[PDB]
Amino acid sequence: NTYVTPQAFWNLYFDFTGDETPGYPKGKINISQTLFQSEMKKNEGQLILFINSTLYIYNSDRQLKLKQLMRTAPNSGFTEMTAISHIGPALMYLAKIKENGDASWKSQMENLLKDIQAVKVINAQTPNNWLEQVNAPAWKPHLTTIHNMIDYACSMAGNYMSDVLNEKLSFDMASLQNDFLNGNKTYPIPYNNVMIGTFMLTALQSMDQLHSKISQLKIDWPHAKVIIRFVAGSNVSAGVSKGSNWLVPFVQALSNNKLATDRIYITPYAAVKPSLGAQELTQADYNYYNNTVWGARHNRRIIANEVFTNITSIFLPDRPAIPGDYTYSKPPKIEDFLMRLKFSLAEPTEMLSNTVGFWMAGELAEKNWNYNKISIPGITTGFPEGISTYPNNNPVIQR
């Protein structure tokens, strides 16, 4: 076919849109561009940008106020906390490896037990205990509990693995759940509680570090502009909707609910501009995020509602309240977070941090970031009836 679109059609097309497309006529200012420039002419806020793994905060004068990496610090206690948490999933994986008839489960569990014994010893080191050296102010009220818990965890998991390898217990998905994950006569606090406790401390550390930094900027929250284009490493399908990104309730918490949720836009296809991260954003890069990205989403919402008043408005629901959410259950159950962990792993839309992210953001908001008043499931709450905290003197690992 030799058919060619008449020029009159392109001229009319380019009158409203196409300004970012190659082929757009050089020199033209279309109706969309006029709109995002008219808004500027006739108290402008901060630009909060979660782009990839970094946070960027820029003021009205295009000056950098904060550049923070969302990546976990080497002195945060993340690796330490996560290593203990992962003992549950590791044992689950080993039960599956056994079911598939792969004998490597025995050698992997032997090494896992050996490495847990080395952790028990290092955790018991005094003075200059690793826990006293970690940068986590929010944990300070519970340092003794955190110590006893890692000790309890190593003792429980170690002696459980020992019993499996010495054939005192059976090994399968069912046995693992009843003999270890749910607890036993010697170790009555379920390992399920240790998994949730450790995750919770990791969420609390991450959120406390961010609140400490963002608080010192004295942001005028009612006028803030929030852009979320956050990528969780290789999870290219997660946190692209507000119900599946705990950064949304977390930012609300930071603002003390003074920032309207409609001022928060998840823009996964927004460009990563060249001057992003510089002390000064270029006017072109600033106008891009402020007007082209944030402004366009905000203006469309206003124009549609102000012009189409004769057309009935549709409202779609948010995702339902599910286990792990702050409001779902009070007090929360440990099983609630286990359910959320499974859901977060299976669902492409979810991040593993959603397991506790939504809960901890709500708790910190409710308790106004006061460490002495917050409850931490798996650390301060969720103990079996009759138990108040993790025991101090725990049996040695018998190999």
Amino acid at 119: V
List binders of its own copies among 179-208 (CB under 8 A).
181-182
At closest approach, how far in Å is the CB of 236 from its own copies? 4
Cα–Cα distances in angstroms (integers) from residue 257 to residues 248, 250, 305, 375, in the given order:
11, 10, 24, 21
Considering the rule CB under 5 A, would residue 343 count as an interface residue with Cl ion?
A: no
Considering the rule CB under 8 A, would residue 127 count as an interface residue with its own copies?
A: no
Considering the rule CB under 8 A, would residue 44 count as an interface residue with its own copies?
A: no
Report how far residue 200's alpha carbon sits from residue 104's, in angstroms, rounded to the nearest whole number. 32
Taking alpha carbons only, the member of 380, 226, 236, 249 closest to residue 321 is 249
At closest approach, how far in Å is the CB of 166 from its own copies? 20
List binders of its own copies among 48-87 (CB under 8 A).
72, 74-75, 79-80, 82-84, 86-87
At closest approach, how far in Å is the CB of 367 from its own copies? 26
Bridge partner list, 68: 55
Report how far residue 394's alpha carbon sits from residue 392's, in angstroms, rounded to the nearest whole number. 6
DSSP 106-125: HHHHHHHHHHHHHHHHHHT-
List binders of its own copies among 81-120 (CB under 8 A).
82-84, 86-87, 89-90, 92-97, 100-102, 104-105, 108, 111-112, 115-116, 118-119
Q: Phi/psi zone of residue 369: left (φ > 0), alpha (ψ -120 to 50 degrees), beta?
A: left
List binders of its own copies among 134-163 (CB under 8 A).
134-135
End-to-end CA distance of the chain: 79
User: What mask, x for binding Cl ion by CB under 5 A, covers residues 269 to 308?
Assistant: ----------------------------------------
Cα–Cα distances in angstroms (integers) from residue 87 to residues 78, 210, 215, 331, in the given order:
15, 28, 36, 26
List binders of its own copies among 11-30 (CB under 8 A).
11-13, 15-21, 29
383 binds, among Cl ion, its own copies, none (CB under 5 to 8 A by kind): Cl ion
| Minimum CB distance to its own copies smaller for 314 or for 388 | 314
Among 327, 372, 393, 398, binds Cl ion (CB under 5 A): 327
Considering the rule CB under 8 A, would residue 302 count as an interface residue with its own copies?
A: yes
Which tokens sit at 70?
A: 């969302």
List binders of Cl ion among 48-107 (CB under 5 A).
52-54
| Minimum CB distance to its own copies smaller for 150 or for 361 | 150
Query: By the 8 A CB rule, do 205 and 136 touch?
Result: yes
Which tokens sit at 199?
A: 């995750």
* Binding-site ranges for Cl ion (CB under 5 A): 52-54, 325-327, 358, 362, 381, 383
